[PDB]
Write a protein that binds this ligand. Structure first.
Ligand code: B12
Length: 192
């Protein structure tokens, strides 16, 4: 069954219980890895398109995204967590597109990297506090809009953790240099 349209429609009409039944069916079909890329991400992108066509209000959108993000954490929670200093993954303050981040987190988790997906738009002061408190080995940011990066002062990301990586269609070597992070175009950041 195309659970995509089903999960989609169940989320657009607020049927959360029903959405969980469809997500669970998708999980049994492709397992975690697949349900993410095949069901979760696509439906999330859909939910986002809908709001970008006025065909959806804010409360409905955030309700859909809250569910999708929760299913993501359950998928991540499924497997153990590898040893090593945690890697915090989020998006820059002001950035609400998180699919890039979700993929980075998942890809890293699939390669044995202890990635902790924090969800999007985390305030620098908090991210820094959390990176320090946990002994995070690295911080990974996904930028889809350039403004959020262009809004930060020089070297704003330098102090976050031992290593800071930036990627996404709104990041580039230039903004990374300016901010104190390492730029990376493809997800093969697995090696670091
Ligand atoms: C979904 C979406 C939303 C959703 C997202 C929800 C969510 N939680 O994710 C929502 C509804 C919330 C949203 C909001 C906005 N967005 Co929007 N929307 C989109 C849409 C449809 C897709 C973006 C997306 O999810 N992209 C996914 C990227 C994330 O994934 P990817 O492609 O696969 O990326 C790859 C690489 O980038 C890389 N990568 C990514 N990250 C990283 C990190 C590292 C370290 C590495 C190595 C690699 C890497 O790997 C990925 C490959 O797998 C586009 C339309 C479009 N044009 O595509 C916009 C778009 C991004 N949204 C857009 C805008 C402007 C907005 C809003 C500000 C709308 C508005 N105009 O008011 C709002 C934000 C609300 C606000 N006031 O703050 C514009 C952006 C303008 C610009 N280019 O500068 C777009 C382009 C729309 C358009 N066509 O005009 N949006």
């Amino acid at each position: 069954e195309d659970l995509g349209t089903g999960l989609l429609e169940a989320l657009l009409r607020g049927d959360l219980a029903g959405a969980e039944a469809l997500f669970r069916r998708g999980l049994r079909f492709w397992g975690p890895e697949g349900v993410l890329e095949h069901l979760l991400l696509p439906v999330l992108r859909e939910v986002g398109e809908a709001w970008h066509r006025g065909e959806i209000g804010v409360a409905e959108e955030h309700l859909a995204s809250t569910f999708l993000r929760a299913r993501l954490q359950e998928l991540l929670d499924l497997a153990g967590f590898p040893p090593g200093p945690p890697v915090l993954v989020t998006t820059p303050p002001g950035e609400r597109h998180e699919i890039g981040a979700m993929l980075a987190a998942y890809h890293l988790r699939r390669k044995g990297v202890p990635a902790l997906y924090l969800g999007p738009d985390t305030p620098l002061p908090d991210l820094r506090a959390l990176a320090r408190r946990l002994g995070a080995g690295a911080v990974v940011l996904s930028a889809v809009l350039s403004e959020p990066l262009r809004a930060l002062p020089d070297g704003a990301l330098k102090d976050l953790a031992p290593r800071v990586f930036l990627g996404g269609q709104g990041a580039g070597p230039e903004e990374a240099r300016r901010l104190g992070a390492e730029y990376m175009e493809d997800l093969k950041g697995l090696a670091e």
